[PDB]
Scaffold this active site. Structure first.
Site, PDB file in Angstrom:
ATOM      1  N   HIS A   1      -4.488   0.633  -5.172  1.00  0.00           N
ATOM      2  CA  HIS A   1      -5.798   0.107  -4.816  1.00  0.00           C
ATOM      3  C   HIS A   1      -6.915   1.124  -4.948  1.00  0.00           C
ATOM      4  O   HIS A   1      -8.049   0.873  -4.493  1.00  0.00           O
ATOM      5  CB  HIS A   1      -5.751  -0.420  -3.390  1.00  0.00           C
ATOM      6  CG  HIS A   1      -4.808  -1.602  -3.207  1.00  0.00           C
ATOM      7  ND1 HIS A   1      -4.038  -1.712  -2.139  1.00  0.00           N
ATOM      8  CD2 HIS A   1      -4.619  -2.634  -4.068  1.00  0.00           C
ATOM      9  CE1 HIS A   1      -3.352  -2.826  -2.316  1.00  0.00           C
ATOM     10  NE2 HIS A   1      -3.703  -3.363  -3.464  1.00  0.00           N
TER      11      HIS A   1
ATOM     12  N   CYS B   1      -4.699   5.197  -1.887  1.00  0.00           N
ATOM     13  CA  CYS B   1      -3.602   4.272  -2.063  1.00  0.00           C
ATOM     14  C   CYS B   1      -3.451   4.092  -3.562  1.00  0.00           C
ATOM     15  O   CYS B   1      -4.419   3.635  -4.182  1.00  0.00           O
ATOM     16  CB  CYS B   1      -3.949   2.974  -1.408  1.00  0.00           C
ATOM     17  SG  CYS B   1      -2.809   1.645  -1.841  1.00  0.00           S
TER      18      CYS B   1
ATOM     19  N   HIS C   1       0.852  -1.174   0.000  1.00  0.00           N
ATOM     20  CA  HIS C   1       0.000   0.000   0.000  1.00  0.00           C
ATOM     21  C   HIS C   1       0.899   1.239   0.000  1.00  0.00           C
ATOM     22  O   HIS C   1       2.088   1.114   0.301  1.00  0.00           O
ATOM     23  CB  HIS C   1      -0.891   0.084   1.258  1.00  0.00           C
ATOM     24  CG  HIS C   1      -1.838  -1.103   1.490  1.00  0.00           C
ATOM     25  ND1 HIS C   1      -2.878  -1.328   0.698  1.00  0.00           N
ATOM     26  CD2 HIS C   1      -1.759  -1.997   2.516  1.00  0.00           C
ATOM     27  CE1 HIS C   1      -3.461  -2.379   1.225  1.00  0.00           C
ATOM     28  NE2 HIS C   1      -2.800  -2.765   2.300  1.00  0.00           N
TER      29      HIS C   1
ATOM     30  N   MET D   1      -9.916   2.115  -2.155  1.00  0.00           N
ATOM     31  CA  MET D   1      -9.054   2.415  -1.020  1.00  0.00           C
ATOM     32  C   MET D   1      -8.660   3.886  -1.047  1.00  0.00           C
ATOM     33  O   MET D   1      -7.633   4.304  -1.597  1.00  0.00           O
ATOM     34  CB  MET D   1      -7.815   1.515  -1.067  1.00  0.00           C
ATOM     35  CG  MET D   1      -7.089   1.572   0.269  1.00  0.00           C
ATOM     36  SD  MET D   1      -5.845   0.294   0.507  1.00  0.00           S
ATOM     37  CE  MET D   1      -5.122   0.857   2.014  1.00  0.00           C
TER      38      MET D   1
HETATM   39 CU   LIG Z   1      -3.579  -0.149  -0.871  1.00  0.00          CU
END
Ligand SMILES: [Cu+2]
Length: 98
Positions: free
Chosen positions: A86, A83, A38, A91
């Site tokens: 993601h 992120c 991440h 996210m």
């Molecule tokens: Cu992530």
């Protein structure tokens, strides 16, 4: 201090919690938890005026469980965070500083 986990224990690609309110200068601890890598990018189109979003981002990947990045925010307002790998899974999170 507000702890934000990066990845839900259940495997969701999410900041948990993804909506928090903090005091100016209050520590936000981003704890690498699951589904990593991440990273933590403050959105330059969603930060208060006068804030450099790149200064407070952590662009490098967080690769190991438990790695913790801490940020304290000074200017009141709303800060959007996402992120990069993601972002398409949802996210993203919102921080309101008072
Ligand atoms: Cu992530």
């Amino acid at each position: 201090a507000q702890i934000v986990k990066l990845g839900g224990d259940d495997g969701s690609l999410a900041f948990v919690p993804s909506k928090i309110s903090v005091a100016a200068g209050e520590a936000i601890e981003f704890v690498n938890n699951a589904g990593f890598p991440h990273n933590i990018v403050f959105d330059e189109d969603a930060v208060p005026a006068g804030v450099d979003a790149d200064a407070i981002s952590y662009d490098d990947y967080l690769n190991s469980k438990g790695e913790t990045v801490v940020r304290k925010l000074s200017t009141p307002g709303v800060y959007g965070v996402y992120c990069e790998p993601h972002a398409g899974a949802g996210m993203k999170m919102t921080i309101t500083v008072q």
